[PDB]
Design a protein around this nucleic acid. Structure first.
Ligand SMILES: [Mg+2]
Ligand SMILES: [Mg+2]
Ligand SMILES: [Mg+2]
Ligand SMILES: [Mg+2]
Ligand SMILES: [Mg+2]
Ligand SMILES: [Mg+2]
Ligand SMILES: [Mg+2]
Ligand SMILES: [Mg+2]
Ligand SMILES: [Mg+2]
Ligand SMILES: [Mg+2]
Ligand SMILES: [Mg+2]
Ligand SMILES: [Mg+2]
Ligand SMILES: [Mg+2]
Ligand SMILES: [Mg+2]
Ligand SMILES: [Mg+2]
Ligand SMILES: [Mg+2]
Ligand SMILES: [Mg+2]
Ligand SMILES: [Mg+2]
Ligand SMILES: [Mg+2]
Ligand SMILES: [Mg+2]
Ligand SMILES: [Mg+2]
Ligand SMILES: [Mg+2]
Ligand SMILES: [Mg+2]
Ligand SMILES: [Mg+2]
Ligand SMILES: [Mg+2]
Ligand SMILES: [Mg+2]
Ligand SMILES: [Mg+2]
Ligand SMILES: [Mg+2]
Ligand SMILES: [Mg+2]
Ligand SMILES: [Mg+2]
Ligand SMILES: [Mg+2]
Ligand SMILES: [Mg+2]
Ligand SMILES: [Mg+2]
Ligand SMILES: [Mg+2]
Ligand SMILES: [Mg+2]
Ligand SMILES: [Mg+2]
Ligand SMILES: [Mg+2]
Ligand SMILES: [Mg+2]
Ligand SMILES: [Mg+2]
Ligand SMILES: [Mg+2]
Ligand SMILES: [Mg+2]
Ligand SMILES: [Mg+2]
Ligand SMILES: [Mg+2]
Ligand SMILES: [Mg+2]
Ligand SMILES: [Mg+2]
Ligand SMILES: [Mg+2]
Ligand SMILES: [Mg+2]
Ligand SMILES: [Mg+2]
Ligand SMILES: [Mg+2]
Ligand SMILES: [Mg+2]
Ligand SMILES: [Mg+2]
Lengths: 138, 150, 128
RNA sequence: UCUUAAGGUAGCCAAAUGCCUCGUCAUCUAAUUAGUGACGCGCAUGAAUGAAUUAACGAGAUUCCCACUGUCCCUGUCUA
RNA sequence: GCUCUGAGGACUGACAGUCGACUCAGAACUGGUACGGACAAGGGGAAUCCGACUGUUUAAUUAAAACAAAGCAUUGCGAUGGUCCUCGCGGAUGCUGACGCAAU
RNA sequence: AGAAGUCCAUUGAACCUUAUCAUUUAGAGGAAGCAGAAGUCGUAACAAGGUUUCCGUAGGUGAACCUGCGGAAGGAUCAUUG
RNA sequence: UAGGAUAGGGGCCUACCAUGGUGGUGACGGGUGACGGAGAAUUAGGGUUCGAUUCCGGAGAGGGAGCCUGAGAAACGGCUACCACAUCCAAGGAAGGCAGCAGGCGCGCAAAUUACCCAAUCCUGACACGGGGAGGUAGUGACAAUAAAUAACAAUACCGGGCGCAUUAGUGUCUGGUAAUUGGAAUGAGUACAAUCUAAAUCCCUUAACGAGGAUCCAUUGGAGGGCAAGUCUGGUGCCAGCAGCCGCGGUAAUUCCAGCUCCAAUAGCGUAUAUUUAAGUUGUUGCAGUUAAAAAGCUCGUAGUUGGACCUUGGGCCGGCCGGCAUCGCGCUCCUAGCCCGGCAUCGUUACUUUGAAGAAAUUAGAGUGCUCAAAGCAAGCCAUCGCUCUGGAUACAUUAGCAUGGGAUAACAUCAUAGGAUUCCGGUCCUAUUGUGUUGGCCUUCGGGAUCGGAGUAAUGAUUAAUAGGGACAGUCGGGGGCAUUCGUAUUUCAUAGUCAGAGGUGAAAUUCUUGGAUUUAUGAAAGACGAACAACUGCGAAAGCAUUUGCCAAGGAUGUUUUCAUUAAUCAAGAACGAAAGUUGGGGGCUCGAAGACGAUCAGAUACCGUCCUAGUCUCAACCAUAAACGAUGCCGACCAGGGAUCGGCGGAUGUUGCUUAUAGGACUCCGCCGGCACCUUAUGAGAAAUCAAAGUCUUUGGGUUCCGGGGGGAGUAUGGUCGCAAGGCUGAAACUUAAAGGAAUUGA
């Protein structure tokens, strides 16, 4: 079991240090790969739309989830990005400037959408919610 | 338990309560010093000395008769073991094992036993060298081991 | 090996949780006798007879079945007279009874005595 | 399905073995029938007729690169 | 190149006397930056193909990727025998013997 | 006293050749994993899954797999005083 | 060491000499999206993450390098040179450095003014006096924090429950709501004379006349299946669009989509996104888990690490109301503190622990006081006859460690009196300094003071804790299919040979390939070869695990038991390191019986590369050398303690009569009864544990701590890529990430 000796402080600190790595979240934060991810440790990331594509939905559902392949201007990555709402995709257009936010679940794909981690919240610097709710149109 | 096998037995000697010698032991402590020195000068180690007193001359315990242990009598008269008893016996054992093993190169269980005996020699020698009963650089040389014993 | 004051405390716990009347403890110590004295003085066991023939020693305690638990915190910590008070909550059933037995330079003695005399020590164990 | 005594297995390759042939792709190049790495329906590779590799070696065959130079641009001149 | 410094020993009576041909470090000064000053004296690297290497080979056009090679394998033979020579009588391996002779 | 110049030093940027370390990125082809879709072929496994299952190692086969030598039961036996 | 240089120590540098310094307690190197700290968030405790930032310390001025002036600079709002960048040019040259304030480009998810002022705080100058983009003020400011509007009160009214009776009424009491209902009240948001504020303006705090009819002076953000509080509303859409953080909704009756009404939650805020803390006892020191779910190394030895048995007086007390002070059977005091001969005094082991104290930068944190209106704050402020000033405050706490000091001396290390070189009041010898008798400086010396050495007499209780239900070692009789070398033996199988006899035999559910009148199978006899050691053989022994069965001998070892033997802590577990490690496998000799991966055939089959059968290679066996893995299993590391019952059985031992197909009689040996150890187990039971199956050890765990090692953190990817390293090779040891996914898995229950 445990080493409870009084002079084994070194042994127990070293043990916890080596074993803190078999925890996934710690390894993910202290291994550095968030800085090889597309945002590279960013909250949002602005980019340009290359084409509105549309991707199928996983087996229990059945749909065409309307996504847009965008390119990130901070680091040159290309990704997919959902356009969340009914009909709201049309406001997006090819080579419009869009802010790619997180789509939820903390960097892991969400819902029935295969291989999408990113949502579009702004296009041409105008709130995508604002165009959905006709508050302020681009 | 037993250090180099998983035996866990508890057989041993249990010394009687009365530290004072029993009545019929009227032995004269000078005469038992003579007896110890005669048996030691006869070439013999303290274990056999104690056996002979217990069995032949009816001395229950040397420390009950004299108050002085066998080794400390022998040290006082300068007949002590130049190599301490049990280390002597372990070296004799390992010399015997190795003399057999140089003729039987394919006796692997005795390779294991010799590794155990030399492990035991080295632990006991480390103790004796911290207690200053052996020279501080006395080292069990397997090559020059056969002379020091038997 | 041995770390007695455990060979003994878990022996009394086993014996009392079963309901035995007299338990015998194969090793003894100044710590053993001074510990059992704290239990008896606080009124948790009755008398006990220390067989000291000529060897390590032996004890036989005569239980009242009024003790509920006793434990040794081997890994004997250190203990100032301010964190008396966050062990007394940490180990004990409540703020009312139960005692932590801390060796102190005024001999082995429990935690309320330790606070009154304003000394710290090293926790040996506890009982409640 | 016909057929054989057995239907070329492990590997290997336009190889000193590939007619087609200057094969197709990549690299080397400003430009490459050359070289190398691949691909293999292999005219006609293939297992002591030995297969595939392989450090060291080599007055052995080839290819690129650095320094070097009258080899050349492009000839001149001196000596026996 | 020149002038030096230092280290490295022998013999005779931890020091003194005498002797010692050579090697190795370092510094100064100096020159038309010349110093292995004549001579003597490896060009180097990245890869392929072949043969393992050393060795031998067509004297007088082929020096090799060819042959030999160690290594591996196969075959025959126990003496009244195997391989071979002789016209014959006989002989080689054999002053040998299977860890041997012989044939690939 | 003193400037230009100059000398021998010391610090020394900066450029250049080579080696080397690290972080990215190209590559014909080779070969992994994942996921999708309404595909082809089989029946390996779960019942004694119709050859009990599986573990080490060796070889072979379109693929699952098979077979040998050894092990186990997580076996289909807690049992021969019948 | 000698020196140089510096303000100065110093390999800071030089010359010479030496070869050292550091490292499993992690050196060196590598990463850091790393300036350090005070501190920030979260916090039951423990902790986890963060710290560019206004306070302190350091560093830097585009990158480096070098300098002058000066007390102070290797200074950049100073210079010199180079590199990058760039400006003016009359074409020669010259001038540069916003990580100062403001601003512009660019980068980016992401950050205000090219404003005013020295009036406050402080600095600076030759200085009451100038300057201060330090600093303060005004402007943008939903970074965060505070207080806090958007209505209140009434009776009428269709009503709606008691209560006036409750009956049978009816209306009636807190006013509950739909009331643009009806009504007079109140007010600030806003506007505005002013005043005050201000360095000048401005915000605020005050306030003249304005400033309310619920449409307006209008409150939103997210939802209404569950988690999660709130629609079995109404239309559209039809597995489409879409929602949905997860589960899921949507395929024509959608509470989930899209919308209207209604409702809910928070409300001047609320969601989304990433990082991070809690949840998370899913990082577990407090506090996890390893039989079967992820996970005990194959096994043992082992160095450092960690951990370590018992014992040594504060044992009885007077004392005065926890202690002062006190005696016994308190090794000394000459010196300070030193009593009306006297407590309580120095130097002749270290620490760790704890107590008290010092010293601890402020801001922060807690916390006191105080009516800024409260508040977040702030460090103010309060009464006088609120008339010529009184009372003042501006506390305290913490501060983990390291360091300094006093007292405690249980607990635990380190250290160490058996060779006595030990302790002890004394005596003089080896030799030296010198003071008051050197009134001066002093200086060798007579009894004298002190080293240091030094011999002998003296005394003392003369100086070593027991022998662990720890360990080693010894001796005795045993025990074992433990090991090695040699060795006898057994039938059987194969082939052979000899002899007989004649149509089959081998194989299967069935066949054939195969052997067979060159006599197969079958019978007996003999030989040869090489493997295997039946039955006895077990819920049995030995072994560290792997494993180990014919006989006898030799060789060496081993547990247990027995012991009034010895030593005395010598011990436990163990990163590095080391031995053994089944089968298969690899290299090379020996052998080549049986079996047999590969391979070939014969059947089966849709196929059959397999199951079945026949032939058969390597292999199977021995030796020499490797390999280093197994479901290497008890899927249960090792040492130790306690806890429940019983009979079996193996080994040893002790005690009992009662008979031997034994024995010169007893003893012994075989058997029976009882009891101790020590094994492998086994059976019933919870009073226990657990997810349970199950477990008497997997128990003595939320009432959680005996020690120690290894190891797991969802499932895959994957024991894969790479790097290293051992190996001839197969391989072994070490060993990720991307990306994928919402389950994978365990135990038991019903069914099928
Ligand atoms: Mg799903
Ligand atoms: Mg051990
Ligand atoms: Mg024991
Ligand atoms: Mg082929
Ligand atoms: Mg051919
Ligand atoms: Mg070809
Ligand atoms: Mg060319
Ligand atoms: Mg090619
Ligand atoms: Mg061919
Ligand atoms: Mg050929
Ligand atoms: Mg050549
Ligand atoms: Mg050659
Ligand atoms: Mg040569
Ligand atoms: Mg020729
Ligand atoms: Mg030639
Ligand atoms: Mg002949
Ligand atoms: Mg199947
Ligand atoms: Mg099967
Ligand atoms: Mg099965
Ligand atoms: Mg097969
Ligand atoms: Mg087969
Ligand atoms: Mg000096
Ligand atoms: Mg940085
Ligand atoms: Mg600062
Ligand atoms: Mg800059
Ligand atoms: Mg500076
Ligand atoms: Mg500077
Ligand atoms: Mg500036
Ligand atoms: Mg600025
Ligand atoms: Mg909605
Ligand atoms: Mg809705
Ligand atoms: Mg809900
Ligand atoms: Mg609800
Ligand atoms: Mg949402
Ligand atoms: Mg919903
Ligand atoms: Mg986790
Ligand atoms: Mg987690
Ligand atoms: Mg867990
Ligand atoms: Mg498991
Ligand atoms: Mg150790
Ligand atoms: Mg016959
Ligand atoms: Mg047996
Ligand atoms: Mg037998
Ligand atoms: Mg393993
Ligand atoms: Mg295992
Ligand atoms: Mg195990
Ligand atoms: Mg018995
Ligand atoms: Mg028994
Ligand atoms: Mg995992
Ligand atoms: Mg499983
Ligand atoms: Mg199940």
């Amino acid at each position: 079991g445990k080493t409870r000796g009084m002079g084994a402080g070194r042994k127990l600190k070293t043990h916890r240090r080596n074993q803190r790595w078999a925890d996934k979240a710690y390894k993910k934060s202290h291994l550095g790969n968030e800085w090889k991810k597309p945002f590279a440790g960013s909250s949002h990331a602005k980019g340009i739309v290359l084409e509105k594509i549309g991707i199928e939905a996983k087996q229990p559902n059945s749909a065409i989830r309307k996504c847009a392949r965008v390119q990130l201007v901070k680091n040159g990555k290309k990704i997919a990005a959902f356009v969340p709402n009914d009909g709201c995709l049309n406001f997006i257009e090819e080579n419009d400037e869009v802010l790619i936010a997180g789509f939820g679940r903390k960097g892991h794909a969400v819902g029935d959408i295969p291989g999408v981690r990113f949502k579009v919240v702004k296009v041409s610097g105008v709130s995508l919610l604002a165009l959905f709710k006709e508050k302020k149109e681009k | 338990g037993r250090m180099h096998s998983r035996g866990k037995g508890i057989s041993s000697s249990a010394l009687p309560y009365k530290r004072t010698p029993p009545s019929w032991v009227k032995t004269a402590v000078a005469d038992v010093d003579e007896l110890i020195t005669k048996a030691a000068k006869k070439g013999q180690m303290p274990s056999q000395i104690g056996v002979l007193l217990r069995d032949q001359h009816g001395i229950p315990l040397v420390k009950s008769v004299t108050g002085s242990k066998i080794l400390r009598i022998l040290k006082a008269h300068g007949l002590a073991p130049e190599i301490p008893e049990d280390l002597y016996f372990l070296i004799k054992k390992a010399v015997a094992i190795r003399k057999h093993l140089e003729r039987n190169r394919k006796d692997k269980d005795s390779k294991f036993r010799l590794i155990l005996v030399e492990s035991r020699i080295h632990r006991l020698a480390r103790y004796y060298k911290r207690t200053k009963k052996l020279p501080p650089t006395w080292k069990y040389e397997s090559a020059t081991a056969s002379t020091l014993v038997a | 090996g041995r770390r007695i004051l455990n060979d003994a405390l878990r022996t009394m716990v086993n014996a009392e949780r079963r309901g035995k009347a007299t338990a015998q403890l194969q090793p003894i110590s100044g710590v053993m006798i001074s510990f059992l004295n704290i239990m008896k003085h606080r009124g948790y066991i009755k008398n006990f007879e220390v067989f000291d023939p000529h060897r390590v020693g032996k004890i036989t305690v005569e239980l009242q079945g009024r003790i509920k638990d006793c434990k040794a915190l081997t890994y004997r910590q250190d203990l100032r007279a301010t964190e008396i008070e966050k062990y007394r909550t940490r180990m004990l059933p409540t703020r009312q009874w139960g005692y932590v037995v801390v060796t102190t330079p005024n001999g082995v003695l429990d935690h309320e005595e330790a606070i009154r005399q304003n000394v710290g020590g090293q926790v040996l164990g506890y009982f409640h």
